[PDB]
Amino acid sequence: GSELETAMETLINVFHAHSGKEGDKYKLSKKELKELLQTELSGFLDAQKDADAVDKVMKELDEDGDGEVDFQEYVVLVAALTVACNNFFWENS
Amino acid sequence: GSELETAMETLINVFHAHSGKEGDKYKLSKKELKELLQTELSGFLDAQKDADAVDKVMKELDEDGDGEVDFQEYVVLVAALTVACNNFFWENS
C-alpha cells in the first residue's frame, strides 16, 4: 500500500523544483504546464506521438491559449494520458 | 525530469492491484476510493487526522454516499490532500 504517498511527493517534488517562495500566488500558464511534462518526458513522449490521445489532453491547456491554470489541476492531466496509454495494453476486442 | 512518468505508474500500479479484466467497466464506489487510500495510508493518514483538510477532500466522495466515481478522477483527490499538507510547510505569515 502507501502507493499514494509515493505519488504525493512526485507532484510536490516536480513542482518544488520550480519555485518555492513564488512572490506571486501559485500560477502556471498553459506553456508552463505543457512544457512541464514535455521537459520531463520530452524524449519519452516522443514515442507517444504515435498516439493521438496526446492531443486529447492538450485540449485542456490548449484552451488556455492566453489563459493559465491553478497548479494541482495538472495532476489529473497526467492521468488522462495514462488511461489512454493503459487502454492500449488492456483492450478485449 | 520524467517525474510524471514515475507517478503515471503509481496510479496505474495501485489500480492494477485491484482488478485488470474487470468484467464490468471501470467503476469504483465511494467506499472503494475512500478505502483505497485509507487502506494504503491507514496508519499514515492517522497523523493527518489532526488536519481538518482531510475531510475537505472527503466532500467529493462523501457526496457520492450512494453514488460512485469513474476512476482516474481519484488522482486529483490525492492532490487536494497534498496542497493542504504542503501548505503547512510553506506559509509566509
Side-chain angles (χ1 to χ4, degrees):
Chain A
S2 70
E3 288 293 348
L4 300 307
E5 350 190 0
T6 309
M8 284 179 113
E9 292 184 347
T10 288
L11 310 172
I12 296 165
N13 284 40
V14 64
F15 170 59
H16 181 98
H18 281 283
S19 63
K21 202 188 190 301
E22 55 207 347
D24 185 48
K25 300 185 186 179
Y26 38 97
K27 271 183 183 178
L28 293 153
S29 71
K30 78 191 172 169
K31 293 184 185 187
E32 276 292 313
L33 209 179
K34 176 174 190 176
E35 293 295 321
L36 191 155
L37 336 98
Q38 292 179 328
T39 51
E40 289 7 280
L41 28 154
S42 134
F44 169 93
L45 102 185
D46 208 346
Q48 295 182 327
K49 293 274 186 168
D50 186 2
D52 294 347
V54 305
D55 203 38
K56 195 180 185 155
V57 331
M58 292 278 144
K59 187 181 193 204
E60 294 187 1
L61 52 96
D62 184 81
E63 186 183 6
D64 293 345
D66 299 341
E68 62 186 340
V69 55
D70 178 273
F71 159 35
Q72 277 70 6
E73 289 184 277
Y74 91 126
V75 300
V76 45
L77 189 86
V78 182
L81 213 173
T82 62
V83 55
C85 170
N86 200 36
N87 292 340
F88 191 96
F89 286 98
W90 325 120
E91 185 183 3
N92 191 86
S93 179
Chain B
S2 70
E3 288 293 348
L4 300 307
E5 350 190 0
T6 309
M8 284 179 113
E9 292 184 347
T10 288
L11 310 172
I12 296 165
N13 284 41
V14 64
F15 170 59
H16 181 98
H18 281 283
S19 63
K21 202 188 190 301
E22 55 206 347
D24 185 48
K25 300 185 186 179
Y26 38 97
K27 271 183 183 178
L28 293 153
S29 72
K30 77 191 172 169
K31 293 184 185 187
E32 275 292 313
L33 209 178
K34 176 174 190 176
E35 293 295 321
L36 191 155
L37 336 97
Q38 292 178 328
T39 51
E40 289 7 280
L41 28 154
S42 134
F44 169 93
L45 103 185
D46 208 346
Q48 295 182 327
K49 293 274 186 168
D50 186 2
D52 294 347
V54 305
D55 203 38
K56 195 180 185 155
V57 331
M58 292 278 144
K59 187 181 193 204
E60 294 187 1
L61 52 96
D62 184 81
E63 186 183 6
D64 293 345
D66 299 341
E68 62 186 340
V69 55
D70 179 273
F71 159 35
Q72 277 70 7
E73 289 184 277
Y74 91 126
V75 300
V76 45
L77 189 86
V78 182
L81 213 173
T82 62
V83 55
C85 170
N86 200 36
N87 292 340
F88 191 96
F89 286 98
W90 325 120
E91 185 183 3
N92 191 86
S93 179

